Structure 1
Amino acid sequence: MELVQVLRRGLQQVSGHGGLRGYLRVLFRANDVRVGTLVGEDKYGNKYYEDNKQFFGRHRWVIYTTEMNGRDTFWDVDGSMVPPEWHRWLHCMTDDPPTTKPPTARKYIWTNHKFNVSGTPQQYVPYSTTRKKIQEWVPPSTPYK
């Protein structure tokens, strides 16, 4: 009996992911075919699912967006593509998703979560943030002598 139901829900796996094409899309992209309730979505396109039935660690997950900040992320993705508001919910540091509890807004907070900028020409180059200490004599211009 459970064999038949087990064979069956493997078809709900392909039905949930928008048919066969989406099934191979998620299989080749996120390496999983499991379905889950759409907890939310961010402005960059990442979709955020949760399934409390899964054991602690895989109860929440992301399908990363195809495109972010002028970069194709269909095939290459990383953990820095998580916006700061949702990084709390994803890492099980809270049970309140940004959809229900949104983080407090302030002027200085960014509006475009840049990913790891290492490698790309938008890297970070250390430099001294202080001015000079010893000044020079700046000799006069009149020949005089």
Structure 2
Amino acid sequence: ELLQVLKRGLQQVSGHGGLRGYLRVLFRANDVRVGTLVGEDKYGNKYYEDNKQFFGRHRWVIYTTEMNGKNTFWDVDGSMVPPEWHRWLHCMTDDPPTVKPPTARKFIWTNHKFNLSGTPQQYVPYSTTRKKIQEWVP
């Protein structure tokens, strides 16, 4: 019973990477876990699942290194990951590249965009009406 607990941790470190791979899942990632991975998403997103662990949990998933133009690996928010949030991430049971396909309409954006934030190229308010016209000419 005691020997099986120590051996399970050794198999997890040996599986995902090794010496340099395990450090990436320890320093950058909050929690280290090994399991089945889909590995099909826009940019450098992995999105893993199938792991048991606890109720309402779908593996490590892992954040992307350089999603669009942020070029950050140490710090990344939920700006990453394409249309999959309502799929295998939380709500639906079927995986986005395995069973349930995304619908095409040629209206949705091909490249996924990050959060607006305080950085340039962000959200803005704009006027709509042409207003009451007034003109005077000689």
TM-score of the pair, normalised by structure 1: 0.83
Question: Greater Rg, structure 1 or structure 2?
Answer: 1
Identify the structure with bigger relative contact order (alpha carbons < 8 Å, sequence gap 6+). Answer: 2
> Using a 3 Å threshold, how does the CA distance of structure 1 residues 81 and 87 change in structure 2: closer, same or farther?
farther
Q: Specify which structure has the higher proportion of strand.
A: 1
1:43 positional shift:
1.9
The answer as to whether partners of 1:40 and 1:99 remain within 8 angstroms in 2 is no
| Runs of at least 4 residues off by over 4 Å | none
Q: Write out aligned runs for 1:1-145 (5 A).
A: 2-138=1-137
- Any unmatched runs of 5+ in structure 2? none
The answer as to whether partners of 1:26 and 1:32 remain within 8 angstroms in 2 is yes
The answer as to whether partners of 1:60 and 1:90 remain within 8 angstroms in 2 is no
1:86 positional shift:
4.8
The answer as to whether partners of 2:33 and 2:59 remain within 8 angstroms in 1 is no
Cα RMSD for the two superposed structures = 1.8
1:87 positional shift:
4.5
- Any unmatched runs of 5+ in structure 1? 139-145
> Using a 3 Å threshold, how does the CA distance of structure 1 residues 93 and 100 change in structure 2: closer, same or farther?
closer
Moved more, 36-45 or 119-128: 36-45
1:48 positional shift:
0.9
The answer as to whether partners of 1:61 and 1:90 remain within 8 angstroms in 2 is no
CA distance in 2, matches of 1:137, 1:128: 24
> Using a 3 Å threshold, how does the CA distance of structure 1 residues 131 and 61 change in structure 2: closer, same or farther?
farther
CA distance in 2, matches of 1:97, 1:52: 17
Q: How many pairs are equivalent?
A: 137
* Same amino acid, percent of matched pairs: 95
